[PDB]
Amino acid sequence: ANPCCSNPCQNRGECMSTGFDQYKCDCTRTGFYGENCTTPEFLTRIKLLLKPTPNTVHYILTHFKGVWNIVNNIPFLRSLIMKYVLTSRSYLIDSPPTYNVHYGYKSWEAFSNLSYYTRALPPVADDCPTPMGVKGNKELPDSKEVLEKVLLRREFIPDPQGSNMMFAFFAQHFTHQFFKTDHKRGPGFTRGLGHGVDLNHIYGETLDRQHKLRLFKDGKLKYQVIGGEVYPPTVKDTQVEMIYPPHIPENLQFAVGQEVFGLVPGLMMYATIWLREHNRVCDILKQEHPEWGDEQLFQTSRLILIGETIKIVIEDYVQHLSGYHFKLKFDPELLFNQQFQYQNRIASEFNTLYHWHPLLPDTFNIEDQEYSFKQFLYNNSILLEHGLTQFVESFTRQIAGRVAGGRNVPIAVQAVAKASIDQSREMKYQSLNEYRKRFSLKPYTSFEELTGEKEMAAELKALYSDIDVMELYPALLVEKPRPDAIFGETMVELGAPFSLKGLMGNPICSPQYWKPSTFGGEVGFKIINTASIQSLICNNVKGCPFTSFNVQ
Amino acid sequence: ANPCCSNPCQNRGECMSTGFDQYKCDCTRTGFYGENCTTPEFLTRIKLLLKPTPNTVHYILTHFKGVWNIVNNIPFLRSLIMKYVLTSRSYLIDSPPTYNVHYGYKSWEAFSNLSYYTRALPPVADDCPTPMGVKGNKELPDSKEVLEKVLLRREFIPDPQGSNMMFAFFAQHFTHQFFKTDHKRGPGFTRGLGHGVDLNHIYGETLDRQHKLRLFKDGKLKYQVIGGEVYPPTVKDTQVEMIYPPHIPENLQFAVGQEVFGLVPGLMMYATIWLREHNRVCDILKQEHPEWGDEQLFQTSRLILIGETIKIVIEDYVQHLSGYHFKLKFDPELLFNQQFQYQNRIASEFNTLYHWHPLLPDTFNIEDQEYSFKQFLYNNSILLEHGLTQFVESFTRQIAGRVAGGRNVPIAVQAVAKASIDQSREMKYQSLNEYRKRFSLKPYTSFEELTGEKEMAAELKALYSDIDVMELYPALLVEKPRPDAIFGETMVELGAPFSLKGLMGNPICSPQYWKPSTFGGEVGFKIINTASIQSLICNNVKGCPFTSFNVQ
Ligand code: HEM
Numbered sequence A, B: 001a002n003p004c005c006s007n008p009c010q011n012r013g014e015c016m017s018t019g020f021d022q023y024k025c026d027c028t029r030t031g032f033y034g035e036n037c038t039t040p041e042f043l044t045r046i047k048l049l050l051k052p053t054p055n056t057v058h059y060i061l062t063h064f065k066g067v068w069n070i071v072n073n074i075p076f077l078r079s080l081i082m083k084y085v086l087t088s089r090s091y092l093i094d095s096p097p098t099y100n101v102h103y104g105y106k107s108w109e110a111f112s113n114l115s116y117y118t119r120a121l122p123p124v125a126d127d128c129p130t131p132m133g134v135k136g137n138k139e140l141p142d143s144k145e146v147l148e149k150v151l152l153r154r155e156f157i158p159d160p161q162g163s164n165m166m167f168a169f170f171a172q173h174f175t176h177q178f179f180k181t182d183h184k185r186g187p188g189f190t191r192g193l194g195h196g197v198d199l200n201h202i203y204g205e206t207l208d209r210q211h212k213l214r215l216f217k218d219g220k221l222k223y224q225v226i227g228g229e230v231y232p233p234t235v236k237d238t239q240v241e242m243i244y245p246p247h248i249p250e251n252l253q254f255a256v257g258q259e260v261f262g263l264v265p266g267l268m269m270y271a272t273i274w275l276r277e278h279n280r281v282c283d284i285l286k287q288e289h290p291e292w293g294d295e296q297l298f299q300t301s302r303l304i305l306i307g308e309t310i311k312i313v314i315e316d317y318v319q320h321l322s323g324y325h326f327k328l329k330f331d332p333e334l335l336f337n338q339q340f341q342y343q344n345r346i347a348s349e350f351n352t353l354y355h356w357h358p359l360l361p362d363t364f365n366i367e368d369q370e371y372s373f374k375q376f377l378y379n380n381s382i383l384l385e386h387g388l389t390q391f392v393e394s395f396t397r398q399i400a401g402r403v404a405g406g407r408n409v410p411i412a413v414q415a416v417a418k419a420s421i422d423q424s425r426e427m428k429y430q431s432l433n434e435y436r437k438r439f440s441l442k443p444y445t446s447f448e449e450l451t452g453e454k455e456m457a458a459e460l461k462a463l464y465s466d467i468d469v470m471e472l473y474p475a476l477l478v479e480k481p482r483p484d485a486i487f488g489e490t491m492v493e494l495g496a497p498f499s500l501k502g503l504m505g506n507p508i509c510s511p512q513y514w515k516p517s518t519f520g521g522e523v524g525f526k527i528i529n530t531a532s533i534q535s536l537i538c539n540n541v542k543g544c545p546f547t548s549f550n551v552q
């Protein structure tokens, strides 16, 4: 019965009830006016005429490779373009943040309480007649039916962009520092109170956990040596709580910053690589600063690793998944003459869209072994048996699955996929098309337009009836991909703003931090500015195997 | 020991050790270069040449009233000047924040741990040969001797700016939402995790406390009615913890957001006024929104009261203490085309400088009574006996003491003033002159220059020996005042940056919050934009007595 249930205000106008059955739209700074903020100002009309579509911009970025090779070697132009990428994306994110699962209006509680994920769109109010507001049936379709018909994998569909298992596990490892759902409280709550790239998945969320993981000599993290190789220490040694099933013996209960990283050896591979990297940087800093104590060595190494992470995420990881011929750049100085907020709050919708389970293969192929999900999960003995070198060589060669395009979620994780649907509903997510509008995208007018195809589209129409009631999460996984691409339009145009804002919003990118002295001088600073996924592997994995996020 | 102990890097350059007995200065973005960041770039030379001193700017702002009267009535020019006041002041504050009591270098711990006050200047390292670094004697002078010789009141010295007890108690009430030292941890730690104007001193720091203070009908806060007058509810009724001696009568144990506010009736006066204001705003919003529930009424009223507070602080409180003929303005829109960070971390030095105990009179004069400190402390019966109307009338008439100029701290609070000195030392504060340099002020070259007189200067020279080892806090209280002013140069040039940044950094000032719908529509927004100390009192105090921050 909330008069704002229909989501009447357009173009980011805010709806407020003015009585039991009346509403008012606040069109402040939208560029539009009128009852529903749909009448454009003159300069807004000009902007809408000139603005190219995401599909047009994507086409330009993924063609003309010869022209981009030239542009990439003109620093002024590369800087200009990267600057526009950062600013245009970041403008789509509210900062300071606004809504959350419990607040569809701005409040001090929603602003101040860091235990909530924020919300890019407010929840559908509890008293609205339908799940999506006023459109659709009284109940959304059975999530098991949605899952089985259009999400579950029949035959494995490989990623045409050539993403590999190094990419899949990097995505999981990296994102799991800021997607840490507090299941005790609910799906709209997080345990990652840093709300970004703080490397708590290496160092621990709390000071007591950090201190249990630290050696307190030379800035270093605790470790063990097994057959001459460095691995994280044990739960027994450190008293650091981890999630393991009872059958895992004490010697295989590795303790790392993030309590869930014993789940799969792919996570423990990266946990081990980053642990080694921290201790490597400690050695470098000690060489430069014989006068420094353990605490400053530890803290400075952490800041360097934060920098390395952001560098690799932009110039290797995002570079790869983007598919662009343009060479992306990690350069905080690009924002120093721009309006930009050095802060971030993690959005629930960002968490939801990043459930990239179709990346996962049917089996995990290491050396000449093909491990099932059941064999792979909670099995660090696989890591010890093969070693990091073989893990990297094998993961670099193994292709990942396509995320968009439908029917590619492995059956082994069907319950996780269903949970993503169900939890979106619990959190009262607005529809796909509302989210499309929120990120300046044209609403889909049919299910065939969404999928680019007839079969799944017809299945969805029978389930949902109205395209305006289609849900965000399943839509991301069935969406028509870009040509030979891993993702469709909605994934990129939502994903990119959340991602780049989260990376550049870090305080190390602010002008008072982005200085050599922050990182122990020019040598420390250069570790950040020259970091890559290859360098990380080369320095910390025996033999310096070749690696990349693309299969060969 | 540490080669950075002498504070060699100038002009906000950062010092890093490069060995046991060698340092480097990082002059990045300072405008200077060379070993100590003292060689200016050409543009810096020009800016230095043209830039007027604070004393010259203060002169211009406090003279030429006829010209300012014209300026104040030309909106474009008033906006231009206020914009420059906000941006030039805020530029002096590091945001995101950097140092704290435990970290003299940037670290993730210092950035992320909200339990610390931040630091405008890093602490003097523990292994430095002297308290201030390398200058001065091995120990600072006896703090009791400094207190007695130059701080303690002989005869009451009234404020020549005419500040009254409404002003004094407003300062105390307002600032104690963000100065809440966690004495269990130490003077460098805070319990005010909002780090700004969140009105926790009305609503409680934690959700548990807030919920005990709330009525859960119509958005309102609980209250009691004594002699037909509204007062805060009791500790017994609410179960909220307050600090009171055990003998205080049950009905006089008033429970409010801030646990210390039973300390003096002056604080409880403002607590009662704001409580009434919250409930008054609830009534207004209920009339506008009969469809709204208790939670939205409560939250929206809180946001409105935050706005009212910022409005009153700038346009009444700061306006008064500034002494300027220019009419200051609370207008978030002034910053929308500027680079500005909507965040704040409370600085330890801001806490220290705001210990304005000389404001306090020898006795508290209400109606025909003159209460001693002993009679006034923890004595809410005084408030009940006289009533709010009489409190306002009396405190509007009673003059407060001068803060600068020396020898005006009442002996009744001598232990608090001594603690301010001792805790500054414990927190390893750098010297007055280092702080002056940090805020673009010229170092004092003698004690006579500091005080503008001979007697106190001579006592200080005998105690401290070197002007470069004079301490910040006692210096603020002995500094030569501006002509017929309450403060000297150092108080204004340090206080203003911290103050204005804390006010404008609030999320309600950000573009996504600063719109009518945030506050329940134009009716709510108007409450903020028309707020004043006179209207606060008129709306909530029987008989609408005249009030002001200056004696008439
Ligand atoms: C390696 C095999 C994997 C397994 C066995 C697995 C399993 C799971 C499970 C059981 C959950 C909890 C779901 C719930 O709350 O009910 C989860 C959450 C999640 N997964 Fe995976 N997953 C895997 C790989 C990946 C990959 C490659 C990604 C790509 C980024 C990913 C992204 C996520 C995200 C973002 C969450 C939400 C985390 C949170 O909110 O705490 N997962 N996964």
Ligand code: HEM
Binding pocket: B168, B169, B171, B172, B175, B179, B180, B181, B263, B264, B266, B351, B354, B355, B356, B357, B359, B360, B377, B413, B416, B419
């Ligand atoms: C009215 C009588 C007042 C009394 C009896 C009083 C007493 C005290 C006491 C006992 C403390 C705690 C000291 C400590 O534990 O280290 C304190 C702190 C403080 N006082 Fe006052 N004071 C009064 C008025 C004022 C006024 C008018 C101001 C003006 C702003 C003020 C500013 C402060 C500040 C900023 C603190 C530090 C708060 C914190 O960090 O927790 N006080 N005062």
Ligand SMILES: *[C@@H]1O[C@H](CO)[C@@H](O[C@@H]2O[C@H](CO)[C@@H](O)[C@H](O)[C@H]2NC(C)=O)[C@H](O)[C@H]1NC(C)=O
Binding pocket: A113, A114, A115, A116, A185, B206, B207, B208
């Ligand atoms: C942030 O919000 C959550 C949700 O309201 C708070 O968690 C609740 O706190 C209340 C009051 O203490 C408890 O009674 C509930 O059991 C908590 N859990 C819920 C409702 O999920 C949390 O306290 C808030 N955090 C802060 C810092 O205030």
Ligand SMILES: *[C@@H]1O[C@H](CO)[C@@H](O[C@@H]2O[C@H](CO)[C@@H](O)[C@H](O)[C@H]2NC(C)=O)[C@H](O)[C@H]1NC(C)=O
Binding pocket: A206, A207, A208, B113, B114, B115, B116, B184, B185, B186
């Ligand atoms: C913020 O920093 C303080 C100071 O280091 C932390 O408090 C300490 O916590 C450690 C580890 O639990 C204890 O050994 C000390 O007793 C505490 N010291 C003091 C002075 O209180 C605090 O835990 C940090 N807060 C957060 C959120 O990490």
Ligand SMILES: CCCCCCCCO[C@@H]1O[C@H](CO)[C@@H](O)[C@H](O)[C@H]1O
Binding pocket: A051, A052, A053, A054, A057, A060, A061, A081, A084, A085, A088, A089, A439, A440
């Ligand atoms: C020639 C390529 C220039 C690089 C800029 C493109 C980076 C992504 O630019 C995006 O394009 C979309 C459609 O115009 C907009 O909706 C987004 O706000 C914008 O960030």
Ligand SMILES: CCCCCCCCO[C@@H]1O[C@H](CO)[C@@H](O)[C@H](O)[C@H]1O
Binding pocket: B051, B052, B053, B054, B057, B060, B061, B081, B084, B085, B088, B089, B439, B440
């Ligand atoms: C005529 C003055 C109108 C402009 C208002 C200026 C408000 C105070 O401006 C201050 O002046 C100081 C001395 O120049 C500077 O050091 C500070 O950075 C600046 O904020």
Ligand SMILES: CCCCCCCCO[C@@H]1O[C@H](CO)[C@@H](O)[C@H](O)[C@H]1O
Binding pocket: B055, B056, B059, B060, B483
């Ligand atoms: C356009 C008008 C410019 C006139 C500016 C008057 C400058 C007054 O400058 C003087 O500077 C001294 C600095 O120590 C202070 O002690 C004096 O109080 C102050 O009057």
Ligand SMILES: CCCCCCCCO[C@@H]1O[C@H](CO)[C@@H](O)[C@H](O)[C@H]1O
Binding pocket: B148, B149, B152, B153, B154, B411, B455, B456, B459
């Ligand atoms: C309220 C005063 C309590 C402390 C006073 C004793 C400390 C001695 O301090 C002295 O006080 C004299 C009298 O004011 C001054 O003439 C001297 O300059 C000063 O050194």
Ligand SMILES: COc1ccc2cc([C@H](C)C(=O)O)ccc2c1
Binding pocket: A085, A089, A318, A321, A322, A328, A491, A492, A493, A495, A496, A497, A499, A500
């Ligand atoms: C989380 O998912 C994504 C998907 C696509 C992205 C594309 C881009 C490029 C650089 C872009 O078009 O902005 C960035 C981040 C992205 C994150």
Ligand SMILES: COc1ccc2cc([C@H](C)C(=O)O)ccc2c1
Binding pocket: B085, B089, B318, B321, B322, B328, B491, B492, B495, B496, B497, B499, B500
């Ligand atoms: C906390 O103590 C102060 C003292 C002086 C101030 C002056 C000003 C004016 C407007 C200024 O010169 O900026 C603002 C705030 C101030 C706070």
Ligand SMILES: *[C@@H]1O[C@H](CO)[C@@H](O)[C@H](O)[C@H]1NC(C)=O
Binding pocket: A006, A007, A008, A034, A035, A036
């Ligand atoms: C505003 O939207 C409503 C429904 O959302 C529609 O009926 C109405 O016509 C719109 N008003 C205008 C003036 O366009």
Ligand SMILES: *[C@@H]1O[C@H](CO)[C@@H](O)[C@H](O)[C@H]1NC(C)=O
Binding pocket: A374, A375, A376, A379, A381, A382, A383, A385
């Ligand atoms: C764990 O992996 C090993 C190989 O390292 C494999 O032989 C074993 O079967 C796995 N454990 C389980 C429970 O499947």
Ligand SMILES: *[C@@H]1O[C@H](CO)[C@@H](O)[C@H](O)[C@H]1NC(C)=O
Binding pocket: B374, B375, B376, B379, B381, B382, B383, B385
């Ligand atoms: C408290 O105030 C009352 C007047 O309201 C006064 O008579 C009494 O002396 C005071 N109590 C104490 C303990 O000083």
Ligand SMILES: *[C@H]1O[C@H](CO)[C@@H](O)[C@H](O)[C@H]1NC(C)=O
Binding pocket: B006, B007, B008, B035, B036
């Ligand atoms: C700073 O370096 C200068 C060189 O210009 C040197 O003369 C001076 O001694 C240094 N600083 C100090 C602490 O004197």
Ligand SMILES: [Cl-]
Binding pocket: A499, A500
């Ligand atoms: Cl990302």
Ligand SMILES: [Cl-]
Binding pocket: B499
């Ligand atoms: Cl202030």
